[PDB]
Design a protein around this ligand. Structure first.
Ligand code: HEM
Ligand SMILES: Nc1ncnc2c1ncn2[C@@H]1O[C@H](COP(=O)(O)OP(=O)(O)OP(=O)(O)O)[C@@H](O)[C@H]1O
Ligand SMILES: [Mg+2]
Lengths: 231, 55, 202, 220, 220, 202
């Protein structure tokens, strides 16, 4: 029984305190139980602690790109007006998550490669995802008239998500043609799993916070002239 | 109740590779706080943004 | 009866409300003109009738069906000429209109354009033609189209009264057989005042 | 009303629009000439970097040629196809983009033999040249149509278009350059050719519907 | 009149928001990253082909941004400057060209530290690339200003008109590539920079005069 | 002796010359209007008076000296708004006038906007003005400028009559003090005929 009126502004106002404080608590517990309470691997040494700070950013970049896909898909066929607004709300959050993942991956790879830049599948894919983001932001900011940036933006998101697995599998296949394989297999180890998952959840919930603030801001910016905003 | 460091910044803040990890921490904390302050401040400006429109 | 009809149509652009809850029957045998001011959304209204623009709320029905559902057969019966002529400027007049001919072309083209007043300009490209004559080439489609709906957006911008009267007769000799000419004008139409059913942006 | 009618008329208006269609061609020539002039007389590296430079040239030329695809339509004739021609709009867009390829992609194809002489490729090299370009440029146009369809309303021809579709063209570039690299090593390239064909077929269906929706949005 | 407030004007017209300033940065980044996808990931290959990559990106940015410098004004704002502003036309066109640089060259220069790490450039290579780039990019708007005005404001223009735009920039790029190759080989390049320094001080003096005369002729 | 003077002006477009041998001298305190029509010489006659274009055969001397010889004492006393007002559509109305004004002290800019009927439209971008207020922004200069010359084309092309009326009564005002007014209007002026000196393209 959806309502989707401007009253959703009040709905956003009813979530920010609780969900934001929960996000800060889970992030601080993850980053203190990590980054100082958990051991590291034998090979990389203490530098392995980047995992708690690097992996969740990359994971939630793809997660909120999937959120882009579902939101725009809802907004196009059903012609839901606010559903097309969700794209701009999550756009710069996605850009920031993917930028953070890029800079961490580059910084984490310095000890093992000796250089700040390595053209691997993981990093290169993140570059293309960041490019899809910044394209979405640029398209939305290109339209002076609102209510259009969000429909065209939605179509752009659909085009990106359709082509995204193709690009990712191509670059993964491209890496095999030149080097051949990854460095070493994936071993999370039981003593180093719970903090990582909790950090994943913390980034989830901070992403939720930022999406809600951006929804509130976009609601104001769009319905700025109606007398509903007399306050 | 089980720290992973035998002692404080004499042992902490120097994991042997402290230079890499700590710059990552700062370069990650900055974008989050920048987004948060930007969103809140721009919302606040919109809130004033109504005021000069009411003139 | 009732092939053209909109349901509680309303559209909002910025602060200004152009109109609210428009709904009116439009059947065969009518000659309709739209009244309004230069700031009114009459151009926005007309483009909405043709389905290019999605209305802010409400909808219009072709024969009683949503336009997107019947978009295929809808274009069978419609002719639209807006502020933008919609004709290729570097392409000559005779072959420009040749596109809009299902059959009988290359010979029936000449008769219509000459009535508009472009005789001797069949094989000249548009960009060496005057803007007033340039409009007429688009208007020349009137004599040849079999579409029941003629939608004109300010079709008398710079068109001579001798042309206007000839044009006015053309839409005066089309509706009585069942045709419909959805019109907007600023020149006071020089035809019987009972032939015009005025609608304003109320 | 038919595919062929819109096809031939779009072709005709393309023939009338000479002297800017050559601008992608002149740009392609200059960019493919800079790098061999940039690097001195050493062919082994030139053979190694030839596919990459020529294919990035093909991308850039495709963008410059595609910049006009909808520019001279919004002010005059983007409509009359949404509004008229009871034939579905995706079909109209398909016909017009095939015409755009015929007037732009084909000049690249006929330009290859001169390029091969300059870059010192072999007959197998020119064969794979043609094979990948013939199956790459239609994909370029098909994938670039959504970007111009979205950005036509802005009428800001420039940097914005070059970042909305160019990141979409990455797999085409990778597979084309990998195939052309493998060809110089005389290995069979049938599987790579099949992959390029599959990519073109996949983009042959989604792009028309996507551009139809994009244009319907951009008109409003 | 009041050169700097003109400067502020074309600063404001081109850019709309704090978020969209970095659009040329993203264009540069995608154009650079196109090559390692196609050329290959090996550093030494990408190391030696740096000059072509970087100055091709600069050339693309310059050509994309020169069209918007004059073509849009023809519809609305070509005049009111040839007709007002008692200050000489060279002054206002110089303002236009230098701001055209500062919206394109400045992003490229400020992005140079990043791109040098992508291509594996060293500190000496980055230093020479930056100093040459800031010394040659402003000229790209100088010689390009007269050419673009004619091609966007002279009707019945033939194919030979574009020959005053694109190929006139070849000497700049060839000297840049040769100089920063010599620097990449760890050799002094001060003489080459003097040649770049000589052309910058000289072209900047005569470019506004010819461009102003060209606009005067083209408007008629 | 005296300001801008025509000297056997000759110009030609295509195959029809728009005029032949115009030579008429204007002094202070003249409100004048060009008659005829606007087919090609609309911008041609005015641009040559401003020095924007060069004449096919002729010249105009401002204050007894060639216009291009000085190029400084002539541009300082001049305003022009025509078919394209020359103001950029991106900026807002308030900021766009500030550069045009010699210092933009902001103590009188809104005063000009207020007197131009653009009350409260200071901070709105000028592109958001519906259909006519964009020309009002250009016409808002005339309250602030100290220039004694005015070359204007279609100053009432879409201006409302009340907007037109205020514009007309200001033109006669400065002509009484030291000014001059030349206008090219298709709409007849609602002023006494003796206050207007008319000339055509001959
Ligand atoms: C050095 C630069 C690195 C970058 C840029 C990077 C980036 C990424 C990316 C993009 C993902 C998402 C994978 C997915 O969603 O399927 C990921 C997850 C993951 N990474 Fe890395 N990574 C790096 C290093 C490593 C290393 C050395 C390991 C060694 C085991 C590793 C182990 C993992 C694991 C186990 C996951 C979880 C996979 C999943 O969630 O599906 N990463 N990282
Ligand atoms: N992008 C836009 N283009 C045009 N009008 C817009 C736009 N956005 C909002 N509007 C508003 O919607 C209304 C639509 O009016 P419309 O454009 O139909 O005027 P019009 O009758 O076509 O003018 P004219 O008769 O001079 O052509 C305008 O009053 C305008 O204020
Ligand atoms: Mg209109």
């Amino acid at each position: 029984q959806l309502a989707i009126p401007p009253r959703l502004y009040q709905i956003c106002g009813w979530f920010i305190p609780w969900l934001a404080i929960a996000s800060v608590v889970v992030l601080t517990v993850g980053w203190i139980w990590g980054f100082g309470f958990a051991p590291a691997d034998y090979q990389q040494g203490n530098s392995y602690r980047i995992i708690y700070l690097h992996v969740p950013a990359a994971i939630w970049s793809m997660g909120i790109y999937a959120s882009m896909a579902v939101a725009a898909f809802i907004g196009l066929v059903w012609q839901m007006k606010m559903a097309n607004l969700a794209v701009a709300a999550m756009a710069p959050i996605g850009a920031v998550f993917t930028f953070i993942a890029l800079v961490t991956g580059s910084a984490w790879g310095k000890p093992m490669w000796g250089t700040w830049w390595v053209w691997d599948a993981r990093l290169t894919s993140e570059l293309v995802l960041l490019f899809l983001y910044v394209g979405v932001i640029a398209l939305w900011h290109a339209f002076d008239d609102r209510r259009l940036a969000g429909r065209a933006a939605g179509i752009l998101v659909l085009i990106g998500v359709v082509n995204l697995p193709i690009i990712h599998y191509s670059v993964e296949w491209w890496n095999t043609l030149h080097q051949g394989s990854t460095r070493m297999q994936q071993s999370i180890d039981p003593a180093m799993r719970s903090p990582l998952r909790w950090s994943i959840f913390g980034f989830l919930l901070l992403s939720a916070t930022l999406t809600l603030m951006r929804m509130r801001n976009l609601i104001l910016l769009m319905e700025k002239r109606r007398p509903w905003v007399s306050e | 109740m089980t720290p992973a460091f035998a002692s404080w910044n004499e042992f902490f803040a120097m994991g042997g590779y402290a230079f890499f990890v700590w710059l990552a921490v700062v370069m990650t904390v900055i974008p989050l706080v920048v987004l948060v302050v930007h969103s809140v401040m721009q919302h606040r400006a919109i809130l004033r943004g109504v005021a000069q429109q009411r003139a | 009866m009732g092939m053209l009809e909109a349901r509680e149509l309303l559209c909002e652009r910025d602060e200004r409300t152009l109109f609210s809850g428009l709904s009116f029957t439009l059947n065969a045998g009518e000659w309709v003109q739209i009244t309004g001011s230069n700031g009114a959304g009459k151009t926005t209204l007309l483009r909405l009738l043709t389905g290019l623009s999605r209305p802010d709320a409400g909808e219009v029905l072709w024969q009683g069906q949503p336009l997107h559902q019947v978009r295929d057969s809808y274009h069978q019966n419609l002719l639209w000429i807006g502020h933008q002529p919609g004709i290729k400027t570097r392409l000559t007049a005779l072959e420009n209109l040749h596109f809009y001919h299902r059959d009988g072309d290359t010979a029936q083209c000449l008769e219509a354009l000459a009535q508009a007043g472009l005789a001797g300009f069949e094989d000249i490209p548009v960009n060496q033609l005057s803007a007033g004559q340039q409009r007429r080439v688009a208007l020349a489609r009137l004599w040849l189209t079999r579409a029941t709906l003629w939608i004109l957006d300010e079709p008398f911008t710079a068109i001579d009264v001798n042309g206007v009267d000839r044009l006015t007769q053309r839409m005066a000799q089309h509706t009585e057989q069942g045709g419909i000419v959805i019109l907007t004008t600023h020149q006071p139409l020089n035809v019987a005042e009972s032939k015009i059913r005025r609608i304003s942006l109320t | 009303m038919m595919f062929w009618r819109i096809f031939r008329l779009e072709l005709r208006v393309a023939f009338r629009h000479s002297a800017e269609i050559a601008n992608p061609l002149w740009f392609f020539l200059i960019v493919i000439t800079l790098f061999p002039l940039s690097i001195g007389p050493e062919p082994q590296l030139l053979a190694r970097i030839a596919p990459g430079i020529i294919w990035v040239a093909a991308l850039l030329s495709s963008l410059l040629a595609l910049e006009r695809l909808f520019r001279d339509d919004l002010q005059d004739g983007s409509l009359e196809q949404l509004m008229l021609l009871p034939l579905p709009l995706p079909a109209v867009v398909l016909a017009k983009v095939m015409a755009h390829w015929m007037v732009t992609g084909l000049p690249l194809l006929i330009l290859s033999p001169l390029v091969a002489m300059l870059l010192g490729m072999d007959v197998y090299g020119w064969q794979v040249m043609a094979l990948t370009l013939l199956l790459g440029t239609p994909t370029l146009g098909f994938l670039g149509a959504p970007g111009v369809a979205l950005t036509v309303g802005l009428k800001r021809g420039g940097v914005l278009l070059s970042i909305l579709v160019l990141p979409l063209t990455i797999p085409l570039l990778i597979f084309a350059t990998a195939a052309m690299d493998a060809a110089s090593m005389h290995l069979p390239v049938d599987g790579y050719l099949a992959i390029l064909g599959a990519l073109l077929a996949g983009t042959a269906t989604l792009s028309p519907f996507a551009t139809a929706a994009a244009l319907r949005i951009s008109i409003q």
